[PDB]
Design a protein around this nucleic acid. Sequence first.
DNA 1: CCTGACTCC
DNA 2: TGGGAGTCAGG
Length: 580
Amino acid sequence: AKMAFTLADRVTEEMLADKAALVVEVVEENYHDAPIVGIAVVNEHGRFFLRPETALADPQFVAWLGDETKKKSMFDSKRAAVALKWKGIELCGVSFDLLLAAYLLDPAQGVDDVAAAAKMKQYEAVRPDEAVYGKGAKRAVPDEPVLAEHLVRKAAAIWELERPFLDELRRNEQDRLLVELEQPLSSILAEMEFAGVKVDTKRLEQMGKELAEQLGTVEQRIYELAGQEFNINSPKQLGVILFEKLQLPVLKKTKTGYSTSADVLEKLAPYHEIVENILHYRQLGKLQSTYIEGLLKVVRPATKKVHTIFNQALTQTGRLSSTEPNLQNIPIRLEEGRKIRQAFVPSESDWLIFAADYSQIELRVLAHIAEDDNLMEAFRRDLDIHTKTAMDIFQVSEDEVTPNMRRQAKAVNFGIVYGISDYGLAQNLNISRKEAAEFIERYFESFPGVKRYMENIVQEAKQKGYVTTLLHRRRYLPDITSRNFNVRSFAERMAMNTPIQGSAADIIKKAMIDLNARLKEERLQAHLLLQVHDELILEAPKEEMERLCRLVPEVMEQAVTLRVPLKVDYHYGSTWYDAK
DNA sequence: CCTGACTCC
DNA sequence: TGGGAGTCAGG
């Protein structure tokens, strides 16, 4: 805890070495158009703190930032890159990101500051961010000497930790996953976030006006059926109305009282019509609160764009998540909500939205990893996999599969991937549990490779302590041998599912890197706007659609070679809604 | 603040 | 007694 550094007034030459640890500090959680509060550089020649007002205005330092041959090691480089884009400055030459390194080594650690990564190698010459800045309403940037020491200690930690982290990744055969996948993807996500998605606010506002009217009508209908006014958005008050006033059967309880979940309310429809009304109301209410009001609150008014942040180092399976706003959960399943997508429009005139999605990628990945003959053959023939499972389960010819049979079979196919039990399947389908049990039993008799995979992967997790994905992502499962049934079972289901969900994440990430390269190689104006787990959304001039129609699906299908084909569907139109 | 509701994959 | 997420209002 005796670290010397130069609190510099101007930029000098020794600060611009061809290798440095760099800290560009953005304290606001949402880094879009957020202030840069300080800069630190550590390199061969010493340790330096710079004021942004000075440094970001100095052409030598800006030139260095954007010089791809001057290599930088950082933590959360995407944060810095985007904050710099808002200042009109390009960051290049990031060769090591400690956030992403820590994430690959163990996603469960929840590393989101340098001190937490430093903890993984018993390095303690740096403080947690929360300790320096404070929390909540107490959050503030400290006096310059305090800030400066903190930023320098973060840069110094990155400097000393790079090698130890690379050495462990290399031992895990994850070094290429960092350097050739996650780090390049970080730059692509930075582009997507900064570009943002344009919103038709006039349309959204009109939809909200109509929604408020409809909400009011449904609300009063509910109070009439209930015989009383109450807060419909209060599961507690609702529970009193349903299970005490109206005396409907209690199908499920939670730790706090009666359950009013959608699952339960659906099953109460034979008892009282009010439950269908309430379900409708809570749907409409979430549209209004989240996809109208919440969305309008984050639109930048001068440009009418929304700028999400894709968290690349959060999920336990290798997926991205999307926040403020979340653009990975925009409604699509009910037509009423799906219309929200009409408000998502191209950023330029005479441009269109192009959306491409993988068809059943998790089931194709399962087929591959399990090497199940019958499942692989189905995908090779492009037989409808839900129709196929229905024939095996119900033991009928293909022409005898009723749309209901297929419905149930779809539920089985998707449920197997999550380790669903017969209880869960029976409740999902609202069918006999004896029957649900036989469906699961027949499924595994029909796809014995899948059954072997499920057994083998749990045994592997118990023996190694972790499971792995196609591109070598890991997830540790220290609870897999717990003596407690609930704890152990949850970990076994994680063991089953994580290689599937995580490999699918690996594939779409590689596809984004390959797609970006191809777009840039052909000088297309098309660019990525969003990723939604198994879907990619782009915008482009209308002239480029013919090209994207061939290029995007091809790049996506060819991202990795499995034992079965990957299949991609695609559409385009004048709004996200119309790209269907 | 957590809990349970809604939304997506 | 179904894997992975985020946001919201109510309490």
